[PDB]
Design an enzyme around this catalytic site. Structure first.
Site, PDB file in Angstrom:
ATOM      1  N   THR A  55       2.384  -7.780  -4.410  1.00 13.76           N
ATOM      2  CA  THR A  55       2.885  -8.930  -3.611  1.00 13.76           C
ATOM      3  C   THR A  55       3.604  -9.917  -4.522  1.00 13.76           C
ATOM      4  O   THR A  55       3.229 -10.090  -5.679  1.00 13.76           O
ATOM      5  CB  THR A  55       1.731  -9.633  -2.867  1.00 13.76           C
ATOM      6  OG1 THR A  55       1.127  -8.715  -1.948  1.00 13.76           O
ATOM      7  CG2 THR A  55       2.228 -10.846  -2.099  1.00 13.76           C
ATOM      8  N   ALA A  94      -4.368 -10.529   3.611  1.00 17.67           N
ATOM      9  CA  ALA A  94      -3.409 -10.735   4.691  1.00 17.67           C
ATOM     10  C   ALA A  94      -4.091 -11.217   5.962  1.00 17.67           C
ATOM     11  O   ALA A  94      -3.610 -12.155   6.610  1.00 17.67           O
ATOM     12  CB  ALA A  94      -2.649  -9.441   4.963  1.00 17.67           C
TER      13      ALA A  94
END
Lengths: 204, 225, 242, 201, 213, 238, 199, 244, 227
Positions: free
Chosen positions: D1, D49
């Site tokens: 990420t 997430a």
């Protein structure tokens, strides 16, 4: 270990119509000294003192929570406290935390405020009292102080000699403990006067 | 039999619940009108002094960007139920990610009236908004009873205002015309000169969110009266 | 349906809520005026008793740096409401670092009062509160709260014994002209308090707040000056010009 | 990420990857890691997430109620401290969140980094994720508060590109946003294979 | 000592179109190296427009579907309408985060119809992070199915190709071709292939056999 | 006279007057009718509007795919008991994956409503229900009362002016069993019509119908879905 | 790790702190401030875990300002120290223990300046100088070497500058810039920041 | 009941609790620059009462404070324990003595909650507090059963308070009030108000608060120490009768 | 009627009526000599069938504290139990026997617990609490209100006024525990409506050795106007 995280040393010793109490003056973390004027003896009345060695958090907490109870006691009561009863108050205060124990091992020294006969006691961290008639110790240098008080203590001792005894035990004990020292303070209490001294000690 | 909400009359009545209805006529009057172009809400403010800022008198409020409420009765009950509606409309968004319908907001707000809090709510509410089913107007009562309405008037002069709406209403109207009719009815149940601070007005159209009118937009309809 | 319970009446009233306002109609008068960069409130004094320290008769009480408060009614309920507002003024900086606004804490106090009109076994707070203060953007604010949990905003208001007579005064006098400077915003409050006062000036206590300053309670050395100016401006106009 | 955000003259830029990963397997390459909390606030996703999404939707739910009760749009500092005090009540239970809160208020362009540990910091440059260290370099040599808008766009785009080049758990597209005083605006969604061509030759 | 989880195999797939949506699955249920049954489909009809797939631990697969069925009825009672695909997805996102510290070991795929008739596919994690997609695979062979879908549906790493939209007859052949190959290398993919097609006219079902090894 | 202000108080004749007064609140609602054949169970209501320019109050409620109710009395008690029924049926489908029988639901309703009759600080439920359902024992029609009592019925009408409908049904019970659905609905509508004045008659606006059977979930027909069932009624003179 | 330093004089209390917040290897912020103003003549400097610092310090400053609102006068530094130490110690054997190392500095008209050291186990101790962090091990010897009780402000800042030059020489971490602040009878004053042109 | 208003905005239980104090013994306080004192009358007058205690109506709350009470005595014994707990909680929390106004606010917040919360009776007790703090020095307060405290320079509570108040108004010499002056005034106010004449020393109780070497002191005058105060009163008002 | 209610005069009426139940119980005497305390009361039965060796109006709390009462015995048996528990709590904390004043305080607290709630009536008993602590005797008198009084001598119950004047005219210090028992029995003989036997009264004394309930033999000894 736990109590060796801050250090400490406390001693009490009786005479004939008098009693003494002594402590070191160091505050430090594991191996670093922070402060050299740390309080470990607390008055609980005239002719009655208490001393605390262990974890400093618990020292201050126990002293404050005990002064709480003592003030409420002597307000409800109309009399100052006897040492035998302060011993039991501390024992109860510590046994209330039988599974959350305060890491202290107090030492009490005083004179009964009517007949003025001396008293000395010791307790563990869960409150088993120990009323000796010669001397009591608590801290990290307990063996070293047992060895000195066994050999130097005598039954009847005027204050001029009691001070020398309780000083020469503490000094030579803390001079062999790494995490105890940086000063030694002594209180002598009689019917008529309370004497207080700081001693010439090593600061290593 | 009159005092206490756990006591039936010999005819099976709850007089405290009716006396909660009677507390609505002590509030100023409000009007809501359906139209296929949108919904309108129009109210009297009842200013008691020129010193009070009338914008601090919340008689029409936003529940969401697609639902607006108008109330009459006790202020505290209204604060409670308006907070309930606002919270429910957003819990619905959080869970399902969509807009609650006016019927369901009304259904969920009426369920608190079904709780004896130890006192019936002394407030009635009109809910105007736009849904999948188009513009909708609902009316909630202290009994927790709710129903869809095409035009409804609540408050002090609800009787005469309703007795006029039944004549000026038809299911073909426009919004500019219904706004005119509502203020014409409001003119006739006031002993004070209608002006752009004695009233609020709001609308909720399909392609536009809740919109409270301004002094300019208000005076530009007061002029054609 | 009558007195002694918060139930209802056939007319749709709650008389235990009106009888608490009747206690607010029994205290000492307290006025408030909103200006541009000054906001002034003043409260009648409580008839000192020749042997009493007046340090403890505080009618005006700050809640934070930007907000202030004056009350009329029961004296003891005021202290609890004021402490419970002072706590929220700090819990609001804990929950979000921003400071509080006047309407937020007015709403909180009104909800607290509303909460005591809901149950039996709870008695309404027998006070009102004029809650004046400041904001970010420097917008002066004034609100008034009653026991029923209702709060509005005002350009000027009064509460206590004589509010029904000071409202007429401020109706006849409050304009944009009398808020030109700070000294005219204070003279208005002085003249209004004169309408119920002991014709003195030592029976008056005024506070002020600016966008810059914190709360500032006045001493009689300035109250006397303002009152003398007002007595002179009235000896010249009402008498020497009519 | 990989995420980044910097505030300059004309507001705040926000950029992000589009990759999700479960170990070595690439589950998704179309992930929207910039969370549109409100029309006037933006978030980011790094760590959990499901934690990023749930707690920022919960933040939106409180921001809207704030605006309704008070008739004023919330600040960025308040919006950040809400989230921080919410995720501090689950400290040590195992939440993983790293997210920036971006927006404009009466104080100016605002940027706040919030972590589930309990950090809450204001700054002009932040990057979160595994590829944050590879973006910090480019975005530090290329920064200037007096940058132009297209230059800022290019900087964010190229920093995310260079982060995707090295890091294995970073790739896909580059979704770029721009915060302004009239709300935010989505700018681009550029595949890294496209930018490879233009930034090679 | 007692571990409360066990992997009962399972494989699920969904593809979206402009006027349809498919949700497919195998029918084998396993326990370690053994086989429980060869008739245990992982697909469940929720509404006339929506279908869900569930794979992983089978107890959670059974509990969660009942919870969903009980929440649909409550929605219909309170709102007097049936739910949409996105509302069911966002609700499941909260039902899953309700167990953030004791999760449902379930890999979920929703497939249905948008509010203008277009296809819709929502893929979930065990803790509720969801993502609208065009096609997604889930379960034990998820690593094996998604490349060929990326190629033959997304047209990836293929140049000068006709980017034709996927019709139903092509999608069904493609769906059968991927399970025919996953039954050759994955040991949990098993006996039959259930396919639930969703269209404006309703919901169909089709059973196709696979090798029993 | 003075054993009336509380439900925990008996009278010297052995009666509790608050319960008898709660039973009088059913007579304040509009009339409902319930009836059953051997295959189907029917509820027909007559809706009532507050203002003429508003919608009619909804009288029939969906509880599950095999149970439904029609209400006469206080709205709030009905809205509470319906939400009780719905959860009690969901709780049965969750555990057993079967529909809850109707006898075992009305028994629970009675057990629930019995408490306010005996403990103080709560009001008796001033709502009566007619409950139509279908289970493994056929169709059922149940009446529920504010007295915490309940009856199994061939047919019944409750509400204002319901004695007329009851008198009608009492002399046509011998036909309902072998009636098809149209004739059964028509008997219900005629019994309902017998509760009106001679001025008024049945209309799309003020009639709701609820039907459940073997091959039919509980459906509701409200405004324009009713007009098939009205076509066929003889235009009665007086 | 983070660095705090405090020095006490006859009529003042000097305190400093680094301005660095750090992720795994990178510095996230160089404009950071670890001081918390409890009052007009009290400061609190805090170091520890990420969230515990701000939560604890915000709680204490609000509960200290509430004293001023309710009562109309300030708390002494000796009393704020014990309030802080009571709240740090009640939480120690609990489910929400704060891991925070902190200083406290203040001035009172009667007692004069005061500096208090505390550890994460809530052991209060007042000293003439004190430091926290891995830099204390280096910079406490210099203080013991060159500190005198009648030390002046201008010499105190020089001793501080030497203590921080030793960090820049020996210490394994960067610590490029520092906040500096002073307290006296006239309140708190933000002195110029002691920086080091590393880059 | 106390949770009910009157139409005229009144609370009559709060007034009856305040009327329940005139039945109690008279207690006054006198502030001074050298200190501050209390003076209660002992209505416990009987040939068989023992008087074992240090003091019967003067209660010590702290090292820097005492109080006297008038009204219901059980309520007083409740409030005197609550006061001592508040003081020690403050000490535990800050390790400094509590000021002489926070304690009064803390007890008045308890007394106010009994006029407001359902089924409980307002405390039928007024109190006087004398103490020292490092903020305002010697202080004297006066609580009422409604939860209303007030600072005073001299006040009186209990039987015949309205007469002692009028006397103090006419003989207090603010700014020039020593402790001997205050005791001389107390022996006068307490003799021109007691029904039983001659003011026996058995029928009073006096406590003084002073400071010595930075420590606070709360003493209680003995019998022989009050005999002198009494003897120096008839001499004083016999000289005010010589000039005939 | 209600207990959480003042009268306009400022009186608590149910407490005044609970004291009326004390003023109608059997008499009880109390005398504090120099070296002891005496407690005596009337224990008279309504028939020859009642076994008097089964219930006691004089009861010990500890080795050095004892009780009598006037009024209701059911109410007495609660306060006996409570006092015996409170003494043991004190001992458990401090390992010292409870003083006679602290027990009176903690017992008046119990009596005050029953004066502030609705749904509870106060106790219909007053107590007399004798002790021997710190080389001094003590005697107290707890009331239903929650109020206690230290006495040198007093009497409770029927004819508690003349029985007290008798003590005012026939009691002084420089006594001892044996001259006081004669005075207590003489103070009970005023109200004795019949011949005083060893079984019609009950006596208990406290001293350096502690509290003891005398036996019927010792009662019959001094019932002859002996000592």
């Amino acid at each position: 270990s736990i109590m060796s995280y801050n250090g400490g040393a406390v001693m009490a010793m009786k005479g004939k119509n008098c009693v003494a109490i002594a402590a070191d003056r160091r505050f430090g973390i594991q191996a670093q000294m922070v402060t050299t004027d740390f309080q470990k003896i607390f008055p609980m009345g005239d002719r009655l003192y208490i001393g605390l060695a262990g974890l400093a958090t618990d020292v201050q907490t126990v002293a404050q929570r005990l002064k709480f109870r003592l003030n409420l006691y002597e307000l409800k009561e109309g009399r100052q406290i006897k040492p035998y009863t302060l011993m039991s108050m501390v024992a109860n205060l510590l046994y209330e935390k039988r599974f959350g124990p305060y890491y202290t091992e107090p030492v009490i020294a005083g004179l009964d405020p009517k007949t003025f006969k001396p008293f000395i006691c010791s307790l563990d961290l869960i409150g088993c009292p120990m009323v000796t008639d010669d001397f009591v110790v608590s801290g990290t240098c307990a063996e070293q102080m047992y060895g000195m008080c066994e050999s130097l203590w005598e039954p009847n001792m005027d204050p001029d000699h009691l001070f020398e005894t309780i000083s020469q035990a503490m000094l030579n004990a803390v001079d062999r403990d790494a995490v105890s020292g940086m000063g030694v303070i002594v209180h002598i209490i009689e019917k008529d006067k309370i004497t207080t001294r700081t001693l010439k000690a090593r600061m290593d | 039999y009159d005092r206490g909400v756990n006591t039936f009359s010999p005819e099976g009545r709850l007089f405290q619940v009716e006396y909660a209805i009677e507390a609505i006529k002590l509030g100023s009057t409000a009007i809501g009108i359906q139209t296929s172009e949108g919904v309108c809400l129009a109210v009297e403010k009842r200013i008691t002094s020129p010193l009070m800022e009338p914008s601090s008198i919340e008689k029409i409020v936003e529940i969401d960007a697609h639902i607006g409420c108008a109330m009459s009765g006790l202020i505290a009950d209204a604060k409670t139920l308006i907070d309930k509606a606002r919270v429910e409309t957003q819990n619905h968004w959080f869970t399902y990610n969509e807009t609650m319908t006016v019927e369901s907001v009304t259904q969920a707000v009426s369920n608190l009236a079904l709780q004896f809090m130890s006192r019936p709510f002394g407030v009635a509410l009109l809910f105007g908004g736009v849904d999948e089913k188009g513009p909708q107007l609902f009316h909630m009562d202290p009994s927790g009873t709710f129903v869809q309405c095409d035009a409804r008037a609540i408050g002090s002069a609800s009787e005469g205002a309703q007795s006029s709406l039944q004549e000026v209403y038809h299911k073909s109207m426009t919004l500019k015309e219904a706004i005119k009719s509502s203020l014409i009815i409001l003119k006739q149940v006031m002993e004070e000169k209608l002006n752009a601070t004695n009233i609020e007005l709001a609308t909720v159209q399909p392609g536009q969110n809740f919109h409270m009118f301004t002094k300019e937009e208000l005076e530009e309809v007061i002029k054609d009266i | 349906y009558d007195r002694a319970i918060t139930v209802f009446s056939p007319d749709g009233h709650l008389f235990q809520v009106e009888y608490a306002q009747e206690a607010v109609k029994k205290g000492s008068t307290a006025v408030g005026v909103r200006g541009r960069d000054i906001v002034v409130l003043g409260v009648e004094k409580k008839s000192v008793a020749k042997l009493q320290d007046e340090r403890t008769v505080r009618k005006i009480c700050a809640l934070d740096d930007n907000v202030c408060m004056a009350f009329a009614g029961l004296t003891a309920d005021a202290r609890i409401v004021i402490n419970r507002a002072r706590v929220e003024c700090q819990s609001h900086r804990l929950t979000v670092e921003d400071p509080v606004t006047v309407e937020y804490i007015t709403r909180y106090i009104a909800s607290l009062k509303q909460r005591y009109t809901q149950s039996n076994g709870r008695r309404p707070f027998g006070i009102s509160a004029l809650i004046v203060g400041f904001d970010f953007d420097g917008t002066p604010r004034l609100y008034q709260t009653d026991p029923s949990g209702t709060y509005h905003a005002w350009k000027a208001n009064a509460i206590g014994r004589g509010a029904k007579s000071v409202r007429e005064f401020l109706e006849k006098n409050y304009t944009d002209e009398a808020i030109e400077t700070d000294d005219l915003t204070i003279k208005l409050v002085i003249k209004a308090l004169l309408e119920v006062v002991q014709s003195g000036g030592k029976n008056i206590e005024l506070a002020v707040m600016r966008r810059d300053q914190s709360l500032k309670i006045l001493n009689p050395e300035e109250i006397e000056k303002y009152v003398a100016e007002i007595e002179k401006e009235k000896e010249e106009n009402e008498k020497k010009k009519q | 990420t990989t995420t980044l955000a910097f505030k300059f003259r004309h507001g705040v830029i926000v950029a992000a990857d589009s990759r999700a990963t479960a170990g070595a397997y690439i589950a998704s390459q179309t992930v929207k890691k910039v969370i549109e909390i409100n029309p006037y606030l933006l978030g980011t996703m790094a760590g959990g997430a499901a934690d990023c999404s749930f707690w920022e939707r919960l933040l939106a739910r409180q921001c809207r109620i704030y605006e309704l009760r008070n008739k004023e749009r919330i600040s960025v500092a308040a919006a950040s401290k809400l989230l921080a005090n919410m995720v501090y009540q689950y400290k040590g239970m195992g939440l993983s969140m790293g997210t920036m809160i971006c927006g404009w208020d009466k104080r100016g362009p605002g940027l706040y980094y919030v972590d589930s540990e309990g950090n809450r910091i204001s700054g002009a440059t932040f990057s979160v994720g595994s590829g944050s260290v590879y973006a910090y370099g480019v975005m530090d040599r290329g920064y200037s508060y007096d940058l132009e808008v297209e230059q800022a766009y290019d900087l964010a785009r190229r920093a995310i590109y260079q982060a995707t080049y090295r890091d294995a758990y970073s790739g896909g597209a580059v979704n770029l946003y721009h915060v302004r005083e009239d709300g935010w605006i989505r700018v681009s969604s550029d595949n890294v294979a496209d930018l490879h061509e233009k930034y090679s030759g | 000592r007692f571990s409360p989880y066990v992997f009962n195999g399972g494989t699920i797939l969904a593809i979206a179109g402009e006027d349809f949506a498919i949700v497919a699955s195998d029918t084998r249920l396993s326990e370690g190296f053994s086989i429980h049954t060869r008739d245990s489909p992982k697909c469940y009809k929720l509404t006339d427009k929506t279908v869900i797939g569930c794979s992983g631990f089978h107890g959670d697969c059974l509990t969660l579907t009942k919870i969903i069925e009980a929440r649909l009825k409550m929605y219909k009672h309170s709102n007097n309408k049936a739910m949409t695909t996105g509302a069911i997805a966002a609700m499941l996102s909260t039902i899953l985060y309700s167990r953030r510290f004791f999760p449902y070991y379930v890999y979920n795929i929703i497939g249905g119809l948008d509010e203008e008739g277009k296809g819709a596919v929502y893929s979930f994690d065990p803790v509720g992070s969801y993502q609208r997609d065009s096609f997604k695979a889930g379960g034990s062979a998820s690593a094996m199915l998604q490349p060929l879908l990326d190629n033959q549906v997304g047209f990836k790493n293929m140049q000068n190709v006709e980017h034709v939209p996927l019709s139903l007859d092509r999608a069904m052949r493609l769906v059968k071709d991927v399970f025919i190959s996953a039954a050759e290398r994955d040991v949990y993919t098993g006996d039959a292939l259930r396919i639930c097609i969703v269209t404006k006219e309703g919901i169909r079902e089709e059973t196709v056999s696979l090798r029993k090894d | 006279n003075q054993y009336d202000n509380d439900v925990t108080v008996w009278s010297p004749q052995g009666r509790i007057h608050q319960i008898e007064y709660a039973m009088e609140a059913v007579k304040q609602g509009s009339a409902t009718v319930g009836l059953k054949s051997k295959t189907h169970a029917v509820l027909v209501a007559l809706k009532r509007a507050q203002s003429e320019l508003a919608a009619h109050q909804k009288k029939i409620l969906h509880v599950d795919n095999h149970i439904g109710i029609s209400i006469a009395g206080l709205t709030a008690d009905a809205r509470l008991l319906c939400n009780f029924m719905r959860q009690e049926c969901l709780d049965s489908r969750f555990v057993f994956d079967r529909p809850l029988p109707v006898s075992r639901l009305v028994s629970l309703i009675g057990s629930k409503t019995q408490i306010p009759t005996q403990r103080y600080g709560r009001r008796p439920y001033g709502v009566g229900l007619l409950i139509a359902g279908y289970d493994d024992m056929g169709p059922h029609i149940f009446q529920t009362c504010p007295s915490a009592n309940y009856f199994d019925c061939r047919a019944m009408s409750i509400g204002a002016r319901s004695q007329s409908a009851r008198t009608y049904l009492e002399r046509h019970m011998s036909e309902f069993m072998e009636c098809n659905l149209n004739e059964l609905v028509k008997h219900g509508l005629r019994a309902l019509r017998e509760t009106l004045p001679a001025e008024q008659d049945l209309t799309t606006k003020n009639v709701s119908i609820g039907i459940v059977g073997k091959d039919l979930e509980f459906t509701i027909y409200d405004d324009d879905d009713v007009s098939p069932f009205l076509e066929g009624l003889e235009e009665r003179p007086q | 790790m983070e660095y705090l330093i405090g020095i006490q004089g006859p009529d003042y209390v000097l305190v400093a702190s680094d301005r660095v917040a750090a992720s795994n290897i990178v510095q996230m912020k160089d404009d950071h401030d670890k001081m918390f103003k409890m009052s007009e003549k009290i400061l609190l400097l805090c170091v520890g875990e990420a969230g515990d610092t701000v939560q604890f310090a915000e709680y204490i400053q609000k509960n200290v300002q509430l004293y001023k609102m309710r009562n109309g006068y300030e708390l002494s530094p000796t009393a704020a120290a014990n309030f802080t130490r009571r709240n740090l110690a009640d939480c120690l054997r609990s489910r929400t223990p704060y891991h925070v190392n902190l200083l406290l500095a203040g001035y009172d008209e009667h007692e004069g300046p005061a500096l208090y050291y505390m550890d994460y186990l809530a052991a209060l101790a007042k000293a003439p100088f004190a430091a926290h962090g891995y830099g204390a091990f280096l910079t406490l010897s210099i203080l013991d070497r060159y500190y005198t009780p009648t030390i002046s402000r201008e010499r105190a800042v020089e001793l501080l500058r030497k203590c921080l030059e030793e960090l820049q020489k020996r210490f394994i971490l960067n610590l490029p810039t520092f906040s500096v602040r002073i307290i006296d009878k006239n309140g708190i004053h933000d002195l110029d920041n002691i920086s080091f042109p590393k880059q | 009941r106390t949770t009910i208003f009157s139409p005229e905005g009144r609370l009559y239980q709060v007034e009856y609790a305040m009327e329940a104090i005139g039945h109690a013994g008279t207690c006054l306080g006198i502030l001074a620059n050298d200190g501050v004192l209390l003076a209660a009358e002992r209505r416990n007058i009987h040939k068989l009462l023992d008087e074992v205690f240090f003091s019967e109506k003067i209660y010590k709350l702290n090292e820097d404070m005492a109080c006297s009470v008038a009204g219901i005595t059980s309520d007083a014994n409740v409030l005197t324990n609550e006061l001592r707990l508040i003081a020690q909680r403050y000490l535990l929390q800050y390790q400094e003595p509590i000021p002489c106004e926070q304690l009064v606010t803390a007890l008045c917040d308890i007394k106010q909650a009994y006029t407001q919360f359902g089924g409980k009776r307002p405390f039928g007790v007024s109190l006087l507090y004398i103490g020292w703090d490092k903020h305002y020095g010697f202080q004297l307060y006066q609580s009422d059963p409604s939860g209303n405290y007030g600072g005073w320079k001299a006040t009186c509570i209990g039987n015949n308070s309205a007469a002692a108040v009028s006397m103090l108004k006419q003989d207090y010499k603010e700014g020039e009030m020593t402790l001997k002056s205050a005791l001389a005034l107390a022996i006068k106010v307490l003799n021109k108000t007691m029904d039983v004449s001659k003011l026996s020393a058995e029928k009073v109780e006096i406590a003084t608060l002073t400071r010595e070497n930075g420590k606070t002191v709360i003493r209680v005058l003995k019998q022989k120490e009050v005999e002198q105060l009494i003897k120096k009163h008839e001499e004083e008002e016999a000289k005010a009768e010589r000039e005939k | 009627f209600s207990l959480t209610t003042f009268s306009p005069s400022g009186k608590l009426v149910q407490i005044e009526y609970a004291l009326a139940a004390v003023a109608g119980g059997a008499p009880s005497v109390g005398i504090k000599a120099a070296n002891g305390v005496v407690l005596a009361t009337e224990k008279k039965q309504k028939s020859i069938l009642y076994d008097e060796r089964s219930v006691h109006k004089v009861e010990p709390i500890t080795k050095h504290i004892g009780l009598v009462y006037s009024g209701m015995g059911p109410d007495y048996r609660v306060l006996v139990h409570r006092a015996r528990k409170l003494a043991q709590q004190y001992y458990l904390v401090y390992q010292e026997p409870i003083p006679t004043a602290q027990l009176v305080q903690r017992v008046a607290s119990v009596m005050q617990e029953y004066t502030q709630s609705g749904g509870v009536r106060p106790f219909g008993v007053s107590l007399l609490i004798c002790g021997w602590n710190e080389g001094r005797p003590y005697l107290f008198q707890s009331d239903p209100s929650g109020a206690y009084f230290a006495w040198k001598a007093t009497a409770m119950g029927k004819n508690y006024v003349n029985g007290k004047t008798f003590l005012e005219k026939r009691y002084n210090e420089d006594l001892e525990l044996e001259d006081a028992i004669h005075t207590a029995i003489l103070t009970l003989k005023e109200s004795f409506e019949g011949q005083m036997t060893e079984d019609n009264i009950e006596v208990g004394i406290c001293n350096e050795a502690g509290f003891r309930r005398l036996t019927p033999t010792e009662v019959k000894d001094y019932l002859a106007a002996i000592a």
